[PDB]
């Protein structure tokens, strides 16, 4: 992955969701990943337990209508494809996420904790994800 | 001419290949007036000819980085690195052979001396005399030199015969061809014997293959730290030789095909009333050597004009501007993809081969016997493979930035000198400006030397030259032999005024240092280049 694939995400978002910071719940996820080319993950020919075991590696918090943010999902795809500081679950992935947050602040200090917290969405173990819904 | 669109996309293609683009620029300067035409032909050369080389180099280098990491290529490289490991440890082990009527009585001291560190240096300081003897021959060399050097060829040839046999009869013909330059020296010796005989039986052409011994001077690199970088290059070239030859051979086949095609189209049609040009297509050795021009792309222009007036003119004959376009495009570009593939492959190999010496002899044994400046290419390919008190108040926030303005004004005032009208109005005004500028530069050089004591040598040279020229032009100007040129020549030193900016601007200095470090990177190869060019 470079940004070359990464702008396709904007296109599929605008067309298939028109979310505007939310408005996905979860259907758009597998309405997204199950069609578009596989440098981002699933693709069309992989709507199976292989997709299941990809999703179980992506974990991220929830919003009003069981929805999620734009760039939270963006980092979700990015790290689940490039393997940027992801564990197999638990507080292990949150401490890896703390490492990642430290690294992000180290590169970019100009990110306010509103936007920064958005980029490090902090999916605590108690707070269920949009990832651990169809998995369990 | 720009008459049709097809005549314009051909003139502009000619200008982009940079062949005879100034004749077109000059024609349109004459025909329209020289004020705006430079806006068409400069960006046509910058955009179409330079920027497109940049794109092509970039695209090819990306493709070469992406292709060196395919599995079938990593495999064939590891096969080379392993065999280098074998030889590297094997030679160390072969150092353990340190065993201590004439079959053993003299042939024990020969192989001793004839490998001593004073013998290598005798041979390498006598070949350096050989290649200075045959480099002073010129035309009309004094008649004593012809005879002195005549004896010299025989003397040095016989001496190398002796100090070659002493390695063969004194160490053993069977184990003699086991060192590359030892085979090479035997070859050069037999070639020099050939040259002596053939000069005897055909005086005249004497192409003299005895300067080839200067190649042995490359062995001097063994005493430096640059030996690995170059032995690895030669190893990576000698391994990939069935694929360099089988690739020069394909260049030769396509040159042959285009030579025969040019013979069909233009064979014998070049007998113009002026006389048949040297860039013919009549016979084969003269068709090969014009397809070679068109590939190396230099004056393909004129050959195309001949091949157009051959088949007609600017008339039924211009359909054949298409052999010289499909051979000056797919030739100027397939010959940089061939010769850049060869040189990037066989040199990234020799950079990764030498990164796995210091990563072993300096990181394995030095631990088990008891990034880090990784370039852009190396980073990317590894990522792919993973998948006094007073004057110190000089500093005013407006002194090191207000002298920069004076440097800029002085540089610009250099541009406005009239070179020819020595004593016009402008040159006098600019001479007064010259007084002003050298005044500023000395009034700052002195205070700097006060705060610094004893890049600045550049400032010193410029101010000294300016002061000397002003003094000895104001003082007398006459009564010294032909010293108008003296002031005219110490005023060339003024051109160094722009250079003063390099140290001032911290980022221009950084780019200048990048250029210098690039020059130091290509300096063990610049010397091999100079040696081969000398040969």
């Amino acid at each position: 992955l470079g940004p070359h694939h990464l702008d396709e995400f904007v296109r599929v978002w605008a067309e298939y969701d028109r979310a505007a910071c939310g408005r996905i719940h979860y259907t758009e996820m597998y309405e997204m990943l199950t069609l578009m080319s596989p440098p981002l993950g699933l693709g069309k020919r992989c709507p199976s337990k292989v997709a299941y075991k990809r999703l179980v590696l992506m974990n991220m918090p929830v919003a009003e209508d069981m929805t999620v943010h734009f760039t939270s999902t963006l980092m979700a795809l990015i790290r689940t494809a490039l393997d940027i500081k992801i564990a197999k679950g638990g507080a292990d992935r949150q401490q890896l996420d703390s490492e990642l947050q430290k690294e992000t602040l180290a590169i970019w200090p100009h990110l306010s904790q509103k936007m920064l917290d958005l980029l490090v969405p902090m999916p605590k173990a108690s707070d269920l994800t949009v990832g651990k819904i169809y998995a369990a | 001419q720009f008459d049709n669109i097809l005549f314009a996309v051909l003139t502009v293609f000619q200008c982009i290949t940079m062949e005879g683009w100034t004749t077109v620029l000059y024609n349109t300067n004459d025909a329209l007036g020289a004020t705006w035409n430079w806006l068409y032909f400069i960006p046509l050369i910058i955009i179409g000819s330079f920027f497109v080389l940049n794109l092509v180099l970039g695209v090819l280098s990306g493709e070469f980085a992406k292709e060196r990491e395919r599995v079938e290529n990593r495999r064939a490289f590891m096969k080379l690195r392993r065999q280098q490991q074998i030889e590297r440890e094997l030679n160390g082990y072969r150092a353990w052979i340190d065993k201590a009527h004439k079959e053993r009585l003299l042939r024990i001291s020969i192989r001793h001396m004839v490998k001593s560190q004073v013998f290598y240096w005798i041979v390498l300081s006598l070949v350096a005399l050989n290649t200075a003897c045959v480099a002073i021959v010129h035309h009309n060399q004094p008649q004593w030199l012809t005879h002195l050097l005549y004896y010299a060829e025989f003397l040095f040839l016989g001496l190398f015969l002796l100090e070659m046999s002493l390695k063969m009869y004194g160490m053993g013909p069977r184990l003699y061809f086991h060192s590359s330059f030892n085979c090479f020296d035997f070859g050069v010796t037999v070639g020099s014997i050939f040259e002596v005989v053939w000069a005897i039986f055909r005086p005249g052409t004497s192409f003299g293959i005895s300067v080839l011994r200067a190649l042995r001077l490359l062995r001097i690199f063994k005493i430096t730290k640059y030996w690995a970088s170059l032995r690895n290059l030669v190893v990576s070239l000698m391994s990939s030789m069935k694929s360099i030859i089988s690739l020069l051979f394909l260049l030769f086949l396509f040159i042959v095909v285009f030579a025969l095609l040019g013979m069909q189209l233009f064979g014998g049609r070049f007998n113009f009333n002026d006389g048949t040009p040297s860039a013919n297509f009549d016979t084969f050795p003269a068709a090969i050597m014009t397809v070679f021009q068109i590939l190396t792309g230099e004056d393909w222009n004129e050959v195309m004009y001949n091949g157009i007036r051959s088949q007609g003119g600017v008339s039924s004959g211009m359909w054949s501007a298409i052999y010289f376009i499909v051979l000056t495009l797919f030739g100027n570009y397939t010959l940089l993809n061939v010769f850049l593939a060869i040189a990037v492959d066989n040199l990234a190999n020799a950079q990764e081969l030498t990164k796995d010496e210091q990563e072993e002899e300096e990181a394995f044994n030095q631990k088990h016997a008891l990034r880090h400046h990784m370039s852009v290419w190396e980073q990317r390919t590894s990522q792919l493979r993973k998948h006094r008190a007073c004057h110190y108040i000089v500093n005013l926030r407006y002194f090191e930035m207000c002298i920069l303005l004076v440097i800029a004004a002085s540089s610009i005032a250099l541009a406005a000198e009239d070179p020819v009208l020595t004593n016009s109005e402008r040159n006098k005004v600019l001479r007064y400006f010259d007084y002003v500028f050298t005044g500023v530069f000395t009034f700052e050089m002195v205070i700097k030397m006060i705060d610094q004591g004893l890049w600045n040598i550049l400032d010193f040279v410029v101010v000294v030259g300016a002061l000397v020229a002003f003094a000895l032009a104001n003082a007398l100007g006459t009564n010294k032999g032909r010293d108008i040129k003296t002031i005219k020549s110490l005023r060339v030193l003024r051109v160094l005024r722009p250079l003063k900016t390099i140290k001032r601007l911290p980022k221009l200095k950084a780019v200048f240092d990048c250029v210098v470090t690039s020059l130091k990177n290509v300096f063990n190869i610049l010397i091999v280049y100079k040696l081969f060019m000398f040969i």
């Binding site: - | 040297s278 190396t296 004056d299 010769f339 990522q383 690039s518 190869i525 280049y529 081969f532």
Partner: protein, 72 residues
């Protein structure tokens, strides 16, 4: 091309040319090209490409954990 033209039209010392004589002295001018304009010049381009250091990298070991594709 003009130097090649002079080099083939070559006869003997202190004698004038004769057109397309000694046409084999063109070998010297192709072995030259295969070596210097084609091979060493591309050796130089390749050495400068392979060994090119990033211009400014003194920010904590070049963003130790997030680099070009990760960072950008």
């Amino acid at each position: 091309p003009q130097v090649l033209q002079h080099s083939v039209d070559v006869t003997e010392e202190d004698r004038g040319p004769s057109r397309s004589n000694r046409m084999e002295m063109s070998i010297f001018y192709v072995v030259y090209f295969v070596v210097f304009p084609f091979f060493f010049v591309n050796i130089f381009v390749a050495l400068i490409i392979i060994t090119f250091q990033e211009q400014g990298d003194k920010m904590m070991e070049e963003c130790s954990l997030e680099k070009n594709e990760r960072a950008c």
